Design a protein around this ligand. Structure first.
Ligand code: NA
Ligand code: NA
Lengths: 4, 240, 240, 4
């Protein structure tokens, strides 16, 4: 899970 | 003929319309923006999903801010007279009101203005859908346990996340929002009006996803998308 | 029992819920804000419209920024366990993200935060509707001829106008948006899902209204409302 | 007609  | 009603957009033009997908994965080193692992999964899912809805899909990868603006300008200058609608999907970094080209930011207002009722006459009165997977800030959702027409009319912004918030993307599965959107279009486009589809997307993202991180700041976080509708009619992807 | 589906909010609690109407007409002289002629027509229309939907309506007039925040805090601290939903209507001056008390501004985020999923537990999972008649800036629309859940989930913001734009109020008939909203709730609340009602409101405001002014800058202008939905289910004001 |  990564954020933009 | 008999009684007629006009509550839904006409979607039986010869063509459904264009679906422009801008897939920004790799950014110029000088910007310091990280690569967006998983975005190719999103871009391929969208291409297939909108293909099956009979959109003319055009995928574009790793566009500069200049290339984004030129692409949108050129697309807005086409003759859309035989097309029912227009769809643009933006996959990139962002902040509130902004999406990033590979070398710097573009105001979302700049992109959508090309399609205003007075500036793209062959789309006047037709639904213009912008689907945005991009952050809108850096907030994290901790969750809780359980006649003229206006030039801004007939736009719909399907935002992946609430104003001010990060948006979540899984490096293996794609973004939470695009995953869910494609799944709900696949299941319900021949069944439900578009706002009702996007409501099911809201519920899917809100209930089925939660972040996992070794960093306590980013762990156990939630997301709700944001439907911004300036549409004036019901939108069904099918017709009689 | 037989097969069950869960696509719509439960609206058969003993009470529909509160409808808080904040009607700011007269502002402190030092602010320099003009009086909002016609807003009492809106406030009375809303009271009657939501009365017939069986909401417990509370009308409040000419509240300071301090009184707005204290009212919202106190309302958020009530026990809403027996209530299906919550509705707040704001009638005032505004700009983007802001509504005005009689003596100065209040961040809309400050008001809605009291009702977050984690901060008002007796409304968790229930629809929280904020209906806003207020400007969002000074732009004019010229028109064109024709499990955890997220804390931000289950909010709906029914904005009278697009982000960045003025909102129009007639001194005799009331505001374009509130006039149209009450008319569509009266006609369709026993018939249509709420997003479909608000879409008809969008169309009514967009097609039936155009400003008339002796000032060329403000003449012949149009308006489109903005539906911001973070809801996770369909919302019907009736139940079986 | 007035603006808010
Ligand atoms: Na997402
Ligand atoms: Na209005």
């Amino acid at each position: 899970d990564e954020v933009d | 003929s008999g009684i007629s009603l006009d509550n839904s957009y006409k979607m039986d033009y010869p063509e459904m319309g264009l679906c422009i997908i801008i897939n920004n994965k790799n950014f110029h080193k000088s910007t310091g923006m990280t690569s967006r692992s998983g975005t190719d999964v999103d871009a391929a899912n969208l291409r297939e999903t909108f293909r099956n809805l009979k959109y003319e899909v055009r995928n574009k990868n790793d566009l500069t801010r200049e290339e984004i603006v030129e692409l949108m300008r050129d697309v807005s200058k086409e003759d859309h007279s035989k097309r029912s609608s227009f769809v643009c999907v933006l996959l990139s970094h962002g902040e509130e009101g902004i999406i990033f080209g590979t070398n710097g930011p573009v105001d979302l207002k700049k992109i959508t203005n090309f399609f205003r009722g007075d500036r793209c006459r062959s789309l006047t009165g037709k639904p213009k859908l912008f689907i945005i997977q991009a952050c809108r800030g850096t907030e994290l959702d901790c969750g809780i346990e359980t006649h003229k027409i206006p030039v801004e009319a007939d736009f719909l912004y399907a935002y992946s996340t609430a104003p001010g918030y990060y948006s979540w993307r899984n490096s293996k599965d794609g973004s939470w929002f695009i995953q869910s959107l494609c799944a709900m279009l696949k299941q319900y486009a021949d069944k439900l009006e578009f706002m009702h589809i996007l409501t099911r997307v809201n519920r899917k993202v809100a209930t089925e996803f939660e972040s996992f991180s070794f960093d306590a700041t980013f762990h156990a976080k939630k997301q709700i998308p944001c439907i911004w509708s300036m549409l004036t009619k019901e939108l069904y992807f099918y017709h009689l």
